[PDB]
């Protein structure tokens, strides 16, 4: 939420904040409504390269177990 | 990209029809353990022939 406010968001942290006073399930569909308001903003159509590098960062190490991988 | 190298043992198998029976041993040289060898020899009082 600190990142959320740091981005420039004011009303929707408050709507997320007043629910925690009760943590009730009757007021909870707002959250669900909110969870759907995030995906109707569009796609993040960036480049093939930078989109691959979301995956193509690797940290392969000779410090993992061997007891685990053999069982795996 | 420096991959690891993960090497299981893999336990190489066969099946029964593919078991080769045996190959007989015919003999090579006669399995010596000892052999002769020339050495000098020294008569009593220690000196040499």
Nearest chain A alpha carbon to B7:
A70
Task: Measure the CA–CA gap between B23 and B6, rounded to whole angstroms.
Answer: 36
Q: Tell me A29's DSSP state.
A: H
B6, A60: Cβ pair inside 8 Å?
no
Q: What is the CATH number of domain A1-46?
A: 1.10.10.1990
Method used to solve the structure: cryo-EM
**In units of Å, what resolution does this entry have?**
4.5
Task: Measure the CA–CA gap between A26 and A9, rounded to whole angstroms.
Answer: 25
Task: Measure the CA–CA gap between A12 and B26, rounded to whole angstroms.
Answer: 90
Structure tokens at A41: 């903003």
B3, A60: Cβ pair inside 8 Å?
yes
Task: Measure the CA–CA gap between A11 and B38, rounded to whole angstroms.
Answer: 107
DSSP 3-state percent helix, strand, coil across chain A (nearest 5):
45, 0, 55
Task: Measure the CA–CA gap between A17 and A34, rounded to whole angstroms.
Answer: 13
Which residues, including other chains, have CB under 8 Å from residue B1's CB and lie 6 or more apart?
A58, A60
Note whether B19 and B10 are within 8 A (CB): no
In chain B, which residues touch A (CB < 8 A)? 1-4, 6, 8
Nearest chain B alpha carbon to A67:
B8
**Short-list A42, A39, A43, A17, CA closest to A30:** A17
A60, A69, A70 member nearest B2 (Cβ)? A60
Q: CB count, 10 Å around CB of A35? A: 10
Task: Measure the CA–CA gap between B37 and A38, rounded to whole angstroms.
Answer: 95
């Amino acid at each position: 939420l600190d990142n959320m406010r740091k981005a420039g968001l004011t009303d929707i942290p408050k709507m997320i904040q007043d629910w925690l006073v009760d943590c009730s399930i009757e007021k909870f569909p707002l959250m669900a409504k909110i969870y759907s308001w995030s995906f109707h903003v569009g796609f993040r159509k960036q480049k093939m390269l930078d989109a691959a590098l979301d995956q193509l960062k690797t940290e392969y190490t000779e410090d993992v177990d061997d007891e685990m991988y053999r069982e795996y | 990209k420096t991959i690891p190298t993960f090497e299981p043992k893999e336990s190489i198998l066969k099946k029964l029809e593919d078991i080769k029976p045996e190959q007989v041993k015919k003999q090579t040289k006669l399995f010596r353990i000892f052999e002769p060898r020339q050495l000098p020899v020294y008569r009593a009082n220690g000196e040499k022939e």
